[PDB]
Design a protein around this ligand. Sequence first.
Ligand SMILES: CC[N+](CC)(CC)Cc1ccccc1
Ligand SMILES: CC[N+](CC)(CC)Cc1ccccc1
Ligand SMILES: [Mg+2]
Ligand SMILES: [Mg+2]
Ligand SMILES: [Mg+2]
Ligand SMILES: [Mg+2]
Ligand SMILES: [Mg+2]
Ligand SMILES: [Mg+2]
Lengths: 323, 328
Amino acid sequence: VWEHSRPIADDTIKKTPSFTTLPIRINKQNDVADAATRRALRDWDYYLHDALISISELGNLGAFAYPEVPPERLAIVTYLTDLGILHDDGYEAMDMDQARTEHREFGALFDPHEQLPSRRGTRAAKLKKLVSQILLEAIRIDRDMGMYMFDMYNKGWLSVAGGEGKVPQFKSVEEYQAYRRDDFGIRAFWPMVEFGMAMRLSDEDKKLIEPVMEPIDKAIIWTNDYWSFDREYHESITNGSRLTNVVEVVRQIENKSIDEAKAAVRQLLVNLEQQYLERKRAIYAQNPSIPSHLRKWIEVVGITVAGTHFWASCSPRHHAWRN
Amino acid sequence: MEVWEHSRPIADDTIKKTPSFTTLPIRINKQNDVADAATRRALRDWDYYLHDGLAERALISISELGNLGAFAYPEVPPERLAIVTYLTDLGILHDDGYEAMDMDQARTEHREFGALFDPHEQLPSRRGTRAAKLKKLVSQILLEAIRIDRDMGMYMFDMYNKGWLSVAGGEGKVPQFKSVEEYQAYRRDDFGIRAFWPMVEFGMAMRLSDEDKKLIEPVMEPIDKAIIWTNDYWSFDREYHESITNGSRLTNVVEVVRQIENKSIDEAKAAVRQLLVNLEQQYLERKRAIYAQNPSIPSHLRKWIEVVGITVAGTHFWASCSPRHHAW
Ligand SMILES: CC[N+](CC)(CC)Cc1ccccc1
Ligand SMILES: CC[N+](CC)(CC)Cc1ccccc1
Ligand SMILES: [Mg+2]
Ligand SMILES: [Mg+2]
Ligand SMILES: [Mg+2]
Ligand SMILES: [Mg+2]
Ligand SMILES: [Mg+2]
Ligand SMILES: [Mg+2]
């Protein structure tokens, strides 16, 4: 099932505060991911002229989020991830109305199909060439999957994140998670993995893997929340950037200190990882002839949680705010 | 704080003499005889309505531990208790018929019954024997609730339809649940949770404002899962049998866990028991937070927050020995 990734040794993992229980692997082409991050940084500055994104001491976020992706596709998905981070950081700092407008106008640039002329502010107008250029690169590698991925970057993320009204006050984990799925862009992320692995999941495929994706989606999102809480909380105080984080929700609705809320979220995460293993075991026990691409998918999502956990445990993006 | 008025605590030895495992304290409405009389009234009316039914042998709220309505409505005065107990028993009897019907005809029967309770008078049935039977079945309870509280009775009946009868069962293909999330969205409709709390509001003569609902959302999150999954835990054996022997749908979180985690029945039940005890502790933590954050919380909202916890415990306790679940 493994082709493009290599395992991180226990001896390396123990040097970090990682606590994931799932297997940690990294794309073998980490240098390609780093080059893609440098390209995104250069292009952002070239087109906008105005950061702590995927690069870290442990390796590039793209090499951990896309472990089983060949290098030409890794360069695309890493670049799109970094472009998304750079955009999202600005979005979190803007007034809700203007933040929403920037999200929607940015998302319209990713539509792979012809659109009638529309008005767009300076920021989206300056990024239009950037987005069309990367779409052409993706299409040249894989037309149908490239167009699908770009369509979902909008439909799964930019068109929905932020909701449509005032900034909500989260009074339940259920309501938090509905908002956070949109805000995290989870419905854009899995299509990027599909593009990276050159497999389009069928509707029937998605139905079969739903029991695995249930704990996986919560785990991947709440793993970011766990590791990014300190920096998000600091930023919210220091400049008003919006704090969207399950640790914060637990702090509030359970009257818990930061450390008590973190301890609770850690237990949720480890339990979700073990639940994923049980849901996955059940799929194997009940599908003796599972197609190879679906076997690959259900295995890859587990290492994707593990790898993004591992990266987040040390990344400058989450930890450089206080040395 | 002393918030109890119409209920009394159940004795520790009585509790230990049952398979109950709720971690929350157990109380019962002091007017159990009123609840039992309401159940018998529902059985009589349903028997007049239904050809060839179980009549007086249907297994609904009456038990040796007490009446389900006395446990589900512990803080309700006797006049209102008779109303909500009757409507709950009628709902159970109707739902048992629904569960035994093919899916689409069951849905149709679910919408038609809900229309009887719609204050907006939509979906009128065509006149005839069927319509006359349904009109007779519900006529007295419709008058009685309005005569005791017009404002809250109209609201309660509107939600008996809108929360439950109008939505339970969905439409189209019967689902094959592949996640607890998907299950719970369907189960909230099928259980009628959005009809149940309005009945409690009617019983306690208190309408929760929109503000009130936002404030208690952190408490209602674990409470709603607990009340529904508590029924699922205790009713699995009957529902599993009915699905196998008679082809009824199986709508039960124990079954979802059993399937999607490839567990034995006993392992699936144990997993759900752990979910339940954890939800009860979570309710306590959420409730403590509300009190810490709202020193001036209104008395009616404190009562509501405490009542929902005893409602989970009491319906758990009843279900641990209830004949419906154990001698069906
Ligand atoms: C908003 C999410 N993200 C990182 C996942 C910024 C933090 C960009 C992104 C969005 C959607 C898919 C992939 C990356
Ligand atoms: C919906 C079926 N029920 C739910 C408790 C028995 C499980 C009766 C009922 C119907 C409508 C409102 C409240 C209860
Ligand atoms: Mg964000
Ligand atoms: Mg952010
Ligand atoms: Mg974050
Ligand atoms: Mg039912
Ligand atoms: Mg039933
Ligand atoms: Mg049941």
